[PDB]
């Protein structure tokens, strides 16, 4: 059979202690499930597992695949599952400067004190928009970070600086 | 974060009978793995009995077949180890496990859990 | 020709921007264009350029903006309006949940944003999930290389468990002099 | 971040004149409206001068006409008031302004420019040695 899609909501990227929700989805109406730690014998009979906080124990590739009849899908894409906060945090820099001319170059540079081989890059997505934001049957989908701001009706384009973010964490279904 | 809520543990006599519990708070064990733990004083982490899966099959270590029971209360969200018939070599300090995840190997081994008890002492003492 | 379809108009990194920060519009048409026109709506300004690279962000700067280009004789319609907002202009307010922040799957919780101060509206944003990409050379950058960046260092030994996260880099690309 | 890096001001006899500046960083004139506003003790603040289009028309407010004069030198990212025949009327706090956007506004209002100087004092006193 065809596929399904694993995905980590909030993140694939969990700090430790953190929560997370691991969700495959196959074709709607669809029961039968299993999740599967690759190089190791644990697994799941779930499409949706949450993490309650992370381990480095939970740390791995993962794939999923569905049943319909006598027959078993595809396994999924790989899904790489990061504890992150493991360590202390390495040092990032601009050389020759974070100000660069539209055309020039630009190399940016990550360095730990500690004996650590490998590194990884990434830039912040973009913040999608929603008193009160009221949110009826909620899925792992609505997990994540939110900040607010507040403005006069009178002047809508000068905004306050941002709350402190608030995790909103989806458990699993009661 | 999640809580593994120690209860009971202490000094027993050889023949003599302990329960230890595990309290789970920021999860429920309805469909987790469980397991308990042992660390004797000179010796390596010790499985001493698991459920792995929802077959709800137990494994025991050969030193406590008959003698130990692991279960589980999903409602009030605790495991247990029953100790029975306690010997000197029983002596140890133990430690819940959970995993979110099941495993198939037939053996409970510590890669296969997250979730830990902080350590209960178990002391098997003729001398009481 | 047929008519001139509408160009696109972009913040860069985002048209959420702090007080005292930089951020690029750029209006992109189709190749080949004579003339391209920035409008600030209600107001007299404008600028007869694509990239606009603003240095500072401030009060003044904030609103509605649109951009048209010409070809030969003819003006396309305008982009979609583009709302520019400064931040950082009051004290931040709190956010918090009710009735808390976990809560289970098919429930129903309601996130509360409230100030210290008299005002009216607020917005609810909810942070996009990052994008990867020693040394990482980045080769004719453009204005869509600015942002916040953060970098991870592990060992091989476990590829899977991470350091926390690199205080962040602002990078800021600005505008061509060519 | 920007700079508008002030220089001139003070004390002068009526009739005399003085030359203020801001030096720019972190962009440069080229492309930008440039504008001198001033505020007068108990007085609200005024345009004096300003170019806010590439059509290199210049406005001058009525009181200053043929006194005073706004330029530009690009290479040395620089703005300059050149006031000639001060008046005690001329007595005030000057600000250089600048916008990377232009303005088809006839006058010089302060809701078009973006970077302000802090303040250049001017004092018009007849009683300077
Ligand atoms: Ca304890």
């Known amino acids: 059979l065809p596929k399904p899609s694993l995905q980590a909501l909030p993140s694939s990227l969990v700090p430790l202690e953190k929560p997370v929700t691991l969700r495959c989805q196959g074709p709607p109406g669809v029961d039968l499930y299993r999740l599967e730690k690759l190089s190791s014998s644990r697994y799941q009979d779930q499409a949706v597992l949450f993490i309650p906080a992370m381990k480095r124990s939970l740390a791995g590739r993962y794939r999923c695949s569905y049943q319909q009849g006598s027959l078993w899908s595809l396994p999924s894409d790989q899904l790489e599952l990061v504890a992150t906060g493991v360590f202390a945090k390495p040092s990032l820099s601009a050389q020759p400067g974070p100000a660069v001319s539209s055309g020039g170059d630009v190399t940016l540079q990550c360095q730990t004190r500690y004996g650590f081989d490998q590194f990884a890059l990434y830039k912040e997505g973009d913040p999608a928009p929603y008193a009160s934001f009221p949110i009826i049957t909620v899925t792992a989908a609505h997990s994540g970070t939110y900040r607010c701001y507040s403005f006069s009706s009178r002047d809508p384009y000068l905004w306050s600086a941002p709350s402190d973010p608030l995790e909103l964490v989806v458990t699993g279904d009661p | ?128």
């Open chain 2, 1 to 128: 974060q999640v809580q593994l809520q120690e209860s009971g543990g202490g000094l027993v006599q050889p023949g003599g009978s302990l329960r230890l519990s595990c309290a789970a708070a920021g999860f429920t064990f309805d469909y987790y793995a469980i397991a308990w733990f042992r660390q004797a004083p000179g010796k390596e982490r010790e499985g001493v009995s698991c459920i792995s899966s929802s077959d709800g099959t137990t494994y025991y270590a050969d030193s406590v077949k008959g003698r130990f029971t692991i279960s589980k209360d999903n409602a009030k969200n605790t495991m247990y180890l029953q100790m029975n018939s306690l010997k000197p070599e029983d002596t140890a300090v133990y430690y819940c496990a959970t995993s979110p995840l099941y495993s198939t190997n037939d053996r409970c081994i510590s890669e296969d859990y997250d979730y830990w008890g902080q350590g209960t002492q178990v002391t098997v003492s003729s001398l009481v």
